[PDB]
Design a protein around this ligand. Structure first.
Ligand SMILES: Nc1ncnc2c1ncn2[C@@H]1O[C@H](COP(=O)(O)OP(=O)(O)O)[C@@H](O)[C@H]1O
Lengths: 327, 379
């Protein structure tokens, strides 16, 4: 089946494999070195020796061996997957030394040889780690302050899009600046990007729960979008921090009436309420559909079912959005 | 009138015709199937092709090339702003659109890049008409795969100016795939890597072909790598030798350089066949005749990195296409520079001995493919 020297290299390969199962790195190297000389046109002996050097932490030697194996496999037309494995291991030495940029370079070569699932996942980990390292390196609170300040100069002139651009650079430079998130939120509210005002206000608020302005900016966007029920709740959270606050009190009072005055046509109610996944779930759930039918037909079904919070709050949500009216 | 296809490059172009069951490649008046994408505005005539290329020696400020680098672009476009710095001709802002200024018959004139291209296309039209014995308007013009919409329309308009019925615009790698019969697999196969090492650019792309339908999955390339920089390394070799023999650096003498460079191109072509080429220029510098040589091995050493760098875009395209090497069913060579044995060797090593598809001359395959598609559109 094999040339005698190939078979001899194989017997040594197998003995080397057993030596590695037992973590006998050095006996195994002896077996693979014999196997390598017996059958030199075969990457497997070289990559196995590299496996030792990788496990030992001797990454420079294992890299030289992987590179030699790659050159040999190409000369001798060995499977592309074998070449890929040697590259994957090279990327692994860099991964282990935390040189993720190099791990990626070599994993990219590995993928070209074969897009091995293991490489795809390991290189993704290398990217995630390197990307976080890069953001942390990017962060610099003083540059964030300079961009923030230019954003403020623009903002204050009514140039909200430019302010937003500078605020974006400032946040890349300082991610915990709660005030900065709310300044962007303001740009969006003024530009009618009310949805974006909400997302930046929410991060501002979680970072600084007492920043009453984060709440008034969010609530204003909600009120503007006729989401008076949440706008009132957000303005109220602002009132919980400071009951004398003007937007928190005034926006709250406008929402208090407007949330009912806007119902108008049921089409407005359906389009707005069904935008909310919570009521979509209530309506998509057949148990609720059955409960609702009983409720329409019998006010006592309501009297009894609403004593249990699992139903009472599904109903309360449908009432809050205006889908269920009670007379 | 028989349909034609035109291969429109930055330094060269070629026209094919489909007649009597096959594509013929039509040589121009100098016997060249591939003729320069040069226009020379002399003080007596507007020359196109080799007539124009040969005038770069005499009126370089009035000759043009690389029209495609300006076509479809805004004047303020960073590409325009960078590339003009390396040209003998002036790029002009006319409505935030580059226009090229030359002196023609002593007059100051400027033409849009599209006009320059139409002049080139007109010449290709004349070549085809003279060959066939009749006017031909039915044509297919190819473009680089990375072209945007303004660029494709601008190319089509250049055809309109030339007087062609532009039937279609085709990406250069699709045309090559057509030329090699890869649209006749009858399968969901093949994944084909097309490697275009051209005059001033290197374009690599992966096309996946499924029973005649083509998709570009990935592109990669180098906008400042092509055959011209191999010629540039060759110029530096010869300049250094001239300098050692005469203690004279001739790289600052534009006439000496243009003539040396032209000879270098010829030596490079010689070396794609032989292992030796001669450099033979009378009065190269200050009346000094310069006679020397280069071997294939020396050329490869001068350009060893240029050749190796062509594989980096290959790796990039494979990753972007999410393919490995094993998944490439075919390898296609496009561009005259792929005739260099070193390129072929690098691709074979990169791809572990897989054959390269050379059944059609690499610098004809695009014109060829365009002619085939043109034939289809017209029959
Ligand atoms: N026989 C040959 N051997 C080696 N190089 C060649 C040969 N013929 C042409 N070339 C080179 O090929 C290039 C021509 O590019 P071309 O094939 O027109 O592609 P593109 O139009 O995409 O730029 C030039 O760099 C030229 O010097």
């Amino acid at each position: 089946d094999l040339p005698e020297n190939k078979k001899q290299a194989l017997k040594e390969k197998e003995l080397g494999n057993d030596a590695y199962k037992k973590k006998d790195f050095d006996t195994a190297l002896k077996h693979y070195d014999k196997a390598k000389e017996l059958d030199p046109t075969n990457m497997t002996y070289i990559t196995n020796q590299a496996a030792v050097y990788f496990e030992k932490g001797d990454y420079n030697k294992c890299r030289e061996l992987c590179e030699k194996a790659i050159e040999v496999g190409r000369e001798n037309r060995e499977d592309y997957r074998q070449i890929a494995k040697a590259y994957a291991r090279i990327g692994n030495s860099y991964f282990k030394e935390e040189k993720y940029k190099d791990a990626i370079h070599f994993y990219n070569k590995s993928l070209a040889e074969h897009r091995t699932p293991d490489v795809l996942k390991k290189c993704q980990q290398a990217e995630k780690i390197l990307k976080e390292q890069e953001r942390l390196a990017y962060i610099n609170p003083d540059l964030a302050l300079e961009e923030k300040n230019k954003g403020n100069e623009c903002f204050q002139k009514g140039d909200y899009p430019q302010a937003m651009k500078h605020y974006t650079e400032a946040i890349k430079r300082n991610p915990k600046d709660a005030k900065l998130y709310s300044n962007r939120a303001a740009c969006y509210t003024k530009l009618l990007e009310f949805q974006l005002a909400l997302k930046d206000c929410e991060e501002c608020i979680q970072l600084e729960p007492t920043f009453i302005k984060g709440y008034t900016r969010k609530a204003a966007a909600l009120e503007a979008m006729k989401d008076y029920t949440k706008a009132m709740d957000v303005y109220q959270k602002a009132l919980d921090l400071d009951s004398s606050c003007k937007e928190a009190a005034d926006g709250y009072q406008r929402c208090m009436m407007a949330q009912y005055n806007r119902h108008d046509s049921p089409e407005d109610v359906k389009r707005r309420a069904m935008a909310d996944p919570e009521v979509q779930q209530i309506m998509s759930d057949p148990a609720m559909r059955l409960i609702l039918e009983q409720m329409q037909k019998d006010p006592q079904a309501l009297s009894e079912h609403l004593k249990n919070p699992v139903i009472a709050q599904k109903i309360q949500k449908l009432m809050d959005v205006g889908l269920i009216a009670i007379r | 009138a028989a349909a034609i296809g035109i291969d429109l490059g930055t330094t060269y172009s070629c026209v094919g015709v489909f007649q009597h069951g096959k594509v013929e490649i039509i040589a121009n008046d100098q016997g060249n199937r591939t003729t320069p994408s040069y226009v020379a505005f002399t003080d007596t005539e507007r020359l196109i092709g080799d007539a124009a290329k040969n005038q770069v020696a005499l009126n370089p400020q009035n000759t043009v090339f690389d029209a495609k680098r300006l076509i479809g672009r805004k004047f303020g476009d960073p590409v325009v702003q960078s590339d003009m710095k390396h040209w003998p001709f002036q790029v002009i802002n006319d409505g935030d659109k580059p226009k090229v200024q030359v002196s023609y018959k002593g007059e100051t004139k400027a033409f849009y890049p599209e006009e320059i291209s139409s002049m080139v296309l007109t010449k290709m039209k004349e070549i085809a008409e003279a060959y066939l014995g009749y006017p031909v308007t039915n044509a297919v013009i190819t473009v680089p795969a990375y072209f945007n919409d303004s660029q494709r329309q601008a190319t089509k308009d250049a055809g309109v100016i030339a007087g062609l019925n532009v039937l279609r615009i085709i990406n250069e790698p699709t045309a090559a795939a057509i030329a090699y019969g890869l649209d006749r697999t009858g399968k969901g196969e093949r994944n084909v890597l097309i490697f275009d090492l051209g005059g001033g650019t290197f374009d690599v792309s992966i096309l996946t072909i499924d029973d005649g339908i083509f998709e570009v999955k990935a592109t990669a390339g180098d906008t400042h790598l092509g055959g011209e920089d191999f010629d540039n390394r060759l110029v530096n070799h010869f300049v250094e030798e001239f300098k050692r023999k005469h203690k004279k650096d001739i790289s600052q003498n534009k006439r000496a350089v243009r003539r040396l460079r032209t000879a270098c191109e010829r030596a490079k072509r010689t070396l794609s066949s032989s292992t030796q080429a001669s450099l033979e220029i009378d009065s190269l510098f200050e009346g000094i005749d310069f006679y020397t040589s280069i071997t294939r091995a020396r050329f490869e050493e001068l350009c060893s990195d240029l050749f190796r760098s062509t594989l980096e875009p290959v790796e990039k395209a494979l990753r972007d296409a999410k393919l490995d090497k094993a998944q490439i069913h075919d390898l296609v060579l496009v561009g005259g520079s792929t005739r260099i044995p070193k390129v072929q060797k690098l691709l074979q090593d990169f791809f572990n001995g897989r054959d390269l598809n050379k059944s059609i001359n690499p610098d004809e395959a695009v014109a060829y493919g365009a002619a085939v598609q043109a034939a289809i559109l017209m029959g």
